[PDB]
C-alpha cells in the first residue's frame, strides 16, 4: 500500500515545509513518489493559510528543491491516516502526544525527525528569529534525516 509521512512544526512555515519538500524530492529522484503520501502541518493555528517563510524559499531555491505549501493545522484525522508523524522539537512532540491521546485511532508513530540523524543533531531548532544560516542548518538536518528515514524507518 502507499506509505505516508507528515512532517510537523509549530507554525508549518519554517521547518516542516522544508522537510516535506526535501523528502518529496528524495522519493521522486528514486522513482518511488507514487508509493508515498507526503505532507506537512502545524501544531498551532498561528500561520494557517500562509506559504513557507520566504527565507526558506530562498534556501530551497539555492539547493534546487521545489517547495510549495499552504500552512495547515494537524487534525484528528491525520493521526489515523499517517504512518509516521515526524516533528522538529520536543515541544512539538509533547503537543502531538497530547493531541494523539484525544482520538480513538492513532496509527501514526510520532517521533522527532532528528532521531534519524546519523550525526545525532536531535533538535531541528526554530529558525524564525534567526538568519539565513539557520535555515541552511535546518535544510541540512532535513536532508540527513529524510535519507535515513527513507532507508529504514524506526
Swiss-Prot record:
GO biological-process terms attached to the record: chemical synaptic transmission
SMART domains associated with the record: LMWPc (SM00226)
Superkingdom as given in the UniProt entry: Eukaryota
Catalytic residues (UniProt): 9 (nucleophile), 15, 126 (proton donor)
InterPro entries, A to Z: LMW_PTPase, Ptyr_pPase, Ptyr_pPase_sf, Tyr_Pase_low_mol_wt_mml, Tyr_phospatase_low_mol_wt
Effect of residue 128 to F: Reduced phosphorylation and activity
Documented effect of changing residue 102 to R: In allele ACP1*A
Keyword Transmembrane assigned: no
Annotated compartments: Cytoplasm
Activity regulation (record text): Inhibited by sulfhydryl reagents.
This enzyme's EC code(s): 3.1.3.48, 3.1.3.2
Top class in the EC scheme: hydrolase
Annotated keywords: Acetylation, Cytoplasm, Hydrolase, Phosphoprotein, Protein phosphatase
GO molecular function, one term: protein tyrosine phosphatase activity
One Pfam family per UniProt: LMWPc
GO cellular component assignments: cytoplasm; cytoplasmic side of plasma membrane; cytosol; extracellular exosome; sarcolemma; synapse
Positions of post-translational Phosphotyrosine modification: 128-129
Family: Belongs to the low molecular weight phosphotyrosine protein phosphatase family.
Function: Acts on tyrosine phosphorylated proteins, low-MW aryl phosphates and natural and synthetic acyl phosphates with differences in substrate specificity between isoform 1 and isoform 2.
Assembly with partners or alone: Interacts with EPHA2; dephosphorylates EPHA2. Interacts with EPHB1.
Protein name per Swiss-Prot or TrEMBL: Low molecular weight phosphotyrosine protein phosphatase
Gene: ACP1
Amino acid at each position: 500500500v502507499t506509505k505516508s509521512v507528515l512532517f510537523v512544526c509549530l507554525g508549518n512555515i519554517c521547518r516542516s515545509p522544508i522537510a516535506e519538500a526535501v523528502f518529496r524530492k528524495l522519493v521522486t529522484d528514486q522513482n518511488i513518489s507514487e508509493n508515498w503520501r507526503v505532507d506537512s502541518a502545524a501544531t498551532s493555528g498561528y500561520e494557517i493559510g500562509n506559504p513557507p517563510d520566504y527565507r526558506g524559499q530562498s534556501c530551497m531555491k539555492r539547493h534546487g528543491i521545489p517547495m510549495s505549501h499552504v500552512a495547515r493545522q494537524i487534525t484528528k484525522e491525520d493521526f489515523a491516516t499517517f504512518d509516521y508523524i515526524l516533528c522538529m522539537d520536543e515541544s512539538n512532540l509533547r503537543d502531538l502526544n497530547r493531541k494523539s491521546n484525544q482520538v480513538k485511532t492513532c496509527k501514526a508513530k510520532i517521533e522527532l525527525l532528528g532521531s534519524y540523524d546519523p550525526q545525532k543533531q536531535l533538535i531541528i531548532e526554530d529558525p524564525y528569529y534567526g538568519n539565513d544560516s539557520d535555515f541552511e542548518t535546518v535544510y541540512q538536518q532535513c536532508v540527513r534525516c529524510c535519507r535515513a528515514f527513507l532507508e529504514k524507518a524506526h
